[PDB]
Each structure stands twice: as C-alpha cells, then as structure tokens.
Amino acid sequence: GSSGSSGSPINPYKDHMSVLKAYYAMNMEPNSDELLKISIAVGLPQEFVKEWFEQRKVYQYSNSRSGPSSG
Numbered sequence: 603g604s605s606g607s608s609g610s611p612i613n614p615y616k617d618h619m620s621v622l623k624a625y626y627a628m629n630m631e632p633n634s635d636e637l638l639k640i641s642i643a644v645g646l647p648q649e650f651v652k653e654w655f656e657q658r659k660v661y662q663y664s665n666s667r668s669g670p671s672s673g
C-alpha cells in the first residue's frame with residue numbers, strides 16, 4: 603500500500619514495451635485477433651509478441667515469491 607501516482611512520462615522506445623503491458627494488464631490470454639494487432643500497433647512481428655505473452659504464463663503459473671525470472 604501507501605502508493606499513488608499523478609502521471610507517467612513518455613518514452614521514445616520503451617513505448618513498444620509499455621503498450622504490450624497495457625494490453626496484457628487488461629487481458630491475460632489474448633486471441634489470435636488481438637495478438638496480431640498487438641504486434642501491429644507497435645510494429646513488431648506477431649511471432650515475437652506471441653512468445654512474449656506465452657512467457658507470462660510461466661510466471662503466472664510459477665511461484666512469484668521464489669526468485670522469479672526478473673524483478
């Protein structure tokens with residue numbers, strides 16, 4: 603707790619990331635339809651984005667407490 607933000611700045615490249623985090627944050631498992639667009643809005647190859655989403659499952663299923671992948 604004890605959290606609170608007024609507003610986040612804008613990133614030139616990071617954008618490609620934040621965006622992906624914005625889609626997932628709303629939906630856990632996207633559909634072939636979304637996946638495509640997701641990689642489009644950013645310009646990345648749907649093939650790549652796909653794996654990116656799959657990985658998330660690894661952590662979501664694996665215990666976070668224990669030394670996770672990153673963070």
